[PDB]
Design a protein around this motif. Structure first.
Motif, PDB file in Angstrom:
ATOM      1  N   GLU A   6      -9.150   1.774  48.510  1.00  0.00           N
ATOM      2  CA  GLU A   6      -9.008   3.216  48.632  1.00  0.00           C
ATOM      3  C   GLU A   6      -9.081   3.591  50.103  1.00  0.00           C
ATOM      4  N   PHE A   7      -8.377   4.651  50.473  1.00  0.00           N
ATOM      5  CA  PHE A   7      -8.454   5.190  51.828  1.00  0.00           C
ATOM      6  C   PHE A   7      -9.617   6.164  51.958  1.00  0.00           C
ATOM      7  CE2 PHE A   7      -4.216   3.611  51.483  1.00  0.00           C
ATOM      8  CZ  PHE A   7      -3.962   3.077  52.728  1.00  0.00           C
ATOM      9  N   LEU A   8     -10.450   5.932  52.966  1.00  0.00           N
ATOM     10  CA  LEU A   8     -11.625   6.739  53.254  1.00  0.00           C
ATOM     11  C   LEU A   8     -11.570   7.200  54.698  1.00  0.00           C
ATOM     12  CD1 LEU A   8     -14.405   4.480  51.623  1.00  0.00           C
ATOM     13  CD2 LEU A   8     -13.200   6.431  50.611  1.00  0.00           C
ATOM     14  N   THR A   9     -12.214   8.332  54.977  1.00  0.00           N
ATOM     15  CA  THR A   9     -12.309   8.780  56.359  1.00  0.00           C
ATOM     16  C   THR A   9     -13.709   9.312  56.628  1.00  0.00           C
ATOM     17  OG1 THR A   9     -11.330  10.185  58.108  1.00  0.00           O
ATOM     18  CG2 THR A   9     -11.384  11.103  55.863  1.00  0.00           C
ATOM     19  N   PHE A  10     -14.131   9.150  57.878  1.00  0.00           N
ATOM     20  CA  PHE A  10     -15.427   9.643  58.319  1.00  0.00           C
ATOM     21  C   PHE A  10     -15.374   9.815  59.829  1.00  0.00           C
ATOM     22  CE2 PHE A  10     -15.548   5.269  56.794  1.00  0.00           C
ATOM     23  CZ  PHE A  10     -15.672   4.546  57.951  1.00  0.00           C
ATOM     24  N   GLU A  11     -16.355  10.555  60.345  1.00  0.00           N
ATOM     25  CA  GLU A  11     -16.453  10.860  61.764  1.00  0.00           C
ATOM     26  C   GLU A  11     -17.653  10.127  62.340  1.00  0.00           C
ATOM     27  OE1 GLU A  11     -13.296  13.967  62.219  1.00  0.00           O
ATOM     28  OE2 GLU A  11     -14.473  12.753  63.623  1.00  0.00           O
ATOM     29  N   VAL A  12     -17.407   9.342  63.356  1.00  0.00           N
ATOM     30  CA  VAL A  12     -18.418   8.586  64.053  1.00  0.00           C
ATOM     31  C   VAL A  12     -18.789   9.124  65.449  1.00  0.00           C
ATOM     32  CG1 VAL A  12     -19.213   6.311  64.737  1.00  0.00           C
ATOM     33  CG2 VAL A  12     -17.666   6.504  62.897  1.00  0.00           C
ATOM     34  N   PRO A  13     -20.039   9.691  65.501  1.00  0.00           N
ATOM     35  CA  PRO A  13     -20.442  10.161  66.823  1.00  0.00           C
ATOM     36  C   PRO A  13     -20.747   9.054  67.763  1.00  0.00           C
ATOM     37  CG  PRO A  13     -21.840  11.136  65.130  1.00  0.00           C
ATOM     38  CD  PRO A  13     -21.191   9.972  64.540  1.00  0.00           C
ATOM     39  N   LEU A  14     -20.437   9.263  69.028  1.00  0.00           N
ATOM     40  CA  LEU A  14     -20.801   8.302  70.045  1.00  0.00           C
ATOM     41  C   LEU A  14     -21.973   8.936  70.820  1.00  0.00           C
ATOM     42  N   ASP A  56     -13.969  -3.538  56.102  1.00  0.00           N
ATOM     43  CA  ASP A  56     -13.043  -2.411  56.088  1.00  0.00           C
ATOM     44  C   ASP A  56     -11.768  -2.758  56.852  1.00  0.00           C
ATOM     45  OD1 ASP A  56     -14.753  -0.738  54.650  1.00  0.00           O
ATOM     46  OD2 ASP A  56     -15.284   0.518  56.374  1.00  0.00           O
ATOM     47  N   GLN A  57     -10.613  -2.328  56.327  1.00  0.00           N
ATOM     48  CA  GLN A  57      -9.373  -2.414  57.082  1.00  0.00           C
ATOM     49  C   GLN A  57      -9.231  -1.137  57.899  1.00  0.00           C
ATOM     50  OE1 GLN A  57      -5.633  -2.229  55.002  1.00  0.00           O
ATOM     51  NE2 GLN A  57      -4.430  -2.723  56.833  1.00  0.00           N
ATOM     52  N   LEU A  58      -8.977  -1.286  59.195  1.00  0.00           N
ATOM     53  CA  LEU A  58      -8.778  -0.127  60.060  1.00  0.00           C
ATOM     54  C   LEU A  58      -7.356   0.402  59.910  1.00  0.00           C
ATOM     55  CD1 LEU A  58     -10.718  -1.077  63.265  1.00  0.00           C
ATOM     56  CD2 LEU A  58     -11.485   0.204  61.261  1.00  0.00           C
ATOM     57  N   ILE A  59      -7.237   1.696  59.633  1.00  0.00           N
ATOM     58  CA  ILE A  59      -5.960   2.336  59.342  1.00  0.00           C
ATOM     59  C   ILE A  59      -5.544   3.269  60.467  1.00  0.00           C
ATOM     60  CG2 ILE A  59      -4.705   3.864  57.749  1.00  0.00           C
ATOM     61  CD1 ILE A  59      -5.319   1.051  56.662  1.00  0.00           C
ATOM     62  N   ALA A  60      -6.477   4.081  60.962  1.00  0.00           N
ATOM     63  CA  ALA A  60      -6.154   5.036  62.006  1.00  0.00           C
ATOM     64  C   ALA A  60      -7.396   5.325  62.832  1.00  0.00           C
ATOM     65  CB  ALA A  60      -5.602   6.350  61.434  1.00  0.00           C
ATOM     66  N   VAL A  61      -7.182   5.601  64.115  1.00  0.00           N
ATOM     67  CA  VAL A  61      -8.236   6.052  65.019  1.00  0.00           C
ATOM     68  C   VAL A  61      -7.783   7.359  65.643  1.00  0.00           C
ATOM     69  CG1 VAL A  61      -9.591   5.552  67.074  1.00  0.00           C
ATOM     70  CG2 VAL A  61      -9.063   3.755  65.459  1.00  0.00           C
ATOM     71  N   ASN A  62      -8.545   8.423  65.396  1.00  0.00           N
ATOM     72  CA  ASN A  62      -8.216   9.761  65.886  1.00  0.00           C
ATOM     73  C   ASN A  62      -6.759  10.119  65.598  1.00  0.00           C
ATOM     74  OD1 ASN A  62     -10.819  10.298  66.805  1.00  0.00           O
ATOM     75  ND2 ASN A  62     -10.410   9.430  68.835  1.00  0.00           N
ATOM     76  N   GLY A  63      -6.295   9.758  64.399  1.00  0.00           N
ATOM     77  CA  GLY A  63      -4.948  10.087  63.984  1.00  0.00           C
ATOM     78  C   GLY A  63      -3.872   9.124  64.433  1.00  0.00           C
ATOM     79  N   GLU A  64      -4.199   8.143  65.272  1.00  0.00           N
ATOM     80  CA  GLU A  64      -3.239   7.124  65.682  1.00  0.00           C
ATOM     81  C   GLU A  64      -3.232   6.016  64.637  1.00  0.00           C
ATOM     82  N   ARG A  86     -21.090  11.687  75.061  1.00  0.00           N
ATOM     83  CA  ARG A  86     -20.932  12.361  73.775  1.00  0.00           C
ATOM     84  C   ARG A  86     -19.467  12.464  73.367  1.00  0.00           C
ATOM     85  N   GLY A  87     -19.202  12.169  72.102  1.00  0.00           N
ATOM     86  CA  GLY A  87     -17.847  12.194  71.591  1.00  0.00           C
ATOM     87  C   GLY A  87     -17.836  11.914  70.107  1.00  0.00           C
ATOM     88  N   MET A  88     -16.629  11.784  69.558  1.00  0.00           N
ATOM     89  CA  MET A  88     -16.468  11.659  68.113  1.00  0.00           C
ATOM     90  C   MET A  88     -15.193  10.886  67.818  1.00  0.00           C
ATOM     91  SD  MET A  88     -18.220  12.882  65.429  1.00  0.00           S
ATOM     92  CE  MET A  88     -18.884  14.397  66.110  1.00  0.00           C
ATOM     93  N   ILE A  89     -15.306   9.809  67.043  1.00  0.00           N
ATOM     94  CA  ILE A  89     -14.155   9.007  66.645  1.00  0.00           C
ATOM     95  C   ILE A  89     -13.918   9.240  65.159  1.00  0.00           C
ATOM     96  CG2 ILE A  89     -13.120   6.717  66.612  1.00  0.00           C
ATOM     97  N   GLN A  90     -12.739   9.754  64.809  1.00  0.00           N
ATOM     98  CA  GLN A  90     -12.361   9.918  63.413  1.00  0.00           C
ATOM     99  C   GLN A  90     -11.649   8.649  62.963  1.00  0.00           C
ATOM    100  OE1 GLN A  90      -8.736  12.079  62.129  1.00  0.00           O
ATOM    101  NE2 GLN A  90     -10.153  13.527  61.157  1.00  0.00           N
ATOM    102  N   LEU A  91     -12.212   7.978  61.967  1.00  0.00           N
ATOM    103  CA  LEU A  91     -11.664   6.729  61.456  1.00  0.00           C
ATOM    104  C   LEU A  91     -11.083   6.932  60.066  1.00  0.00           C
ATOM    105  CD1 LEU A  91     -14.496   4.300  62.571  1.00  0.00           C
ATOM    106  CD2 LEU A  91     -12.178   4.500  63.539  1.00  0.00           C
ATOM    107  N   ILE A  92      -9.947   6.298  59.817  1.00  0.00           N
ATOM    108  CA  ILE A  92      -9.444   6.095  58.469  1.00  0.00           C
ATOM    109  C   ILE A  92      -9.503   4.605  58.197  1.00  0.00           C
ATOM    110  CG2 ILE A  92      -7.511   6.342  56.887  1.00  0.00           C
ATOM    111  CD1 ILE A  92      -6.538   8.682  58.523  1.00  0.00           C
ATOM    112  N   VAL A  93     -10.100   4.237  57.071  1.00  0.00           N
ATOM    113  CA  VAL A  93     -10.229   2.839  56.685  1.00  0.00           C
ATOM    114  C   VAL A  93      -9.720   2.676  55.262  1.00  0.00           C
ATOM    115  CG1 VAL A  93     -12.212   2.480  58.202  1.00  0.00           C
ATOM    116  CG2 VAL A  93     -12.590   3.056  55.787  1.00  0.00           C
ATOM    117  N   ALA A  94      -9.491   1.423  54.881  1.00  0.00           N
ATOM    118  CA  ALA A  94      -9.183   1.076  53.499  1.00  0.00           C
ATOM    119  C   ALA A  94     -10.274   0.134  53.015  1.00  0.00           C
ATOM    120  CB  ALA A  94      -7.798   0.436  53.381  1.00  0.00           C
ATOM    121  N   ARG A  95     -10.940   0.499  51.928  1.00  0.00           N
ATOM    122  CA  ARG A  95     -12.134  -0.196  51.473  1.00  0.00           C
ATOM    123  C   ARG A  95     -11.958  -0.579  50.012  1.00  0.00           C
ATOM    124  NH1 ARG A  95     -17.618   2.776  52.668  1.00  0.00           N
ATOM    125  NH2 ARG A  95     -16.794   2.274  54.754  1.00  0.00           N
ATOM    126  N   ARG A  96     -12.353  -1.803  49.671  1.00  0.00           N
ATOM    127  CA  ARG A  96     -12.072  -2.362  48.346  1.00  0.00           C
ATOM    128  C   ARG A  96     -12.738  -1.585  47.211  1.00  0.00           C
TER     129      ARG A  96
END
Lengths: 96, 5
Positions: A6-14, A56-64, A86-96
């Motif tokens: 399934e495709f999941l997304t979350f925001e990772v603070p730095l 996790d399979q990496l699908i997108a980083v900040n929309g890329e 300080r910052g924020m990385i939006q990740l899309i992953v694919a998780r079993r």
């Protein structure tokens, strides 16, 4: 050994996410399978955040998107997209 | 083959 994911997304603070990734390839099918999380460095940003998971399979980083790219090109895209973070990385992953 | 981000 990819399963149904399934495709999941979350925001990772730095430094950085503190994540090691690797390309997966089937040699019998001569096919690249994507970029996968190999380890999460204990005490790094992704570790402190907790939402990323090993394998996790990496699908997108900040929309890329990393899709439609051979593993070498997807790795380059990953490095380039993280190079401006300080910052924020939006990740899309694919998780079993 | 392994990159750290």
């Amino acid at each position: 050994e990819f399963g149904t994911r399934e495709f999941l997304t979350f925001e990772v603070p730095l430094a950085g996410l503190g994540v090691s990734v690797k390309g997966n390839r089937s040699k019998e099918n001569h096919a690249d399978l994507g970029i996968f999380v190999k380890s999460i460095i204990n005490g790094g940003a992704a570790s402190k955040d907790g939402r990323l998971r090993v394998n996790d399979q990496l699908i997108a980083v900040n929309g890329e998107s990393l899709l439609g790219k051979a593993n070498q090109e997807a790795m380059e895209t990953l490095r380039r997209s993280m190079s401006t973070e300080r910052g924020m990385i939006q990740l899309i992953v694919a998780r079993r | 083959t392994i990159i750290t981000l």
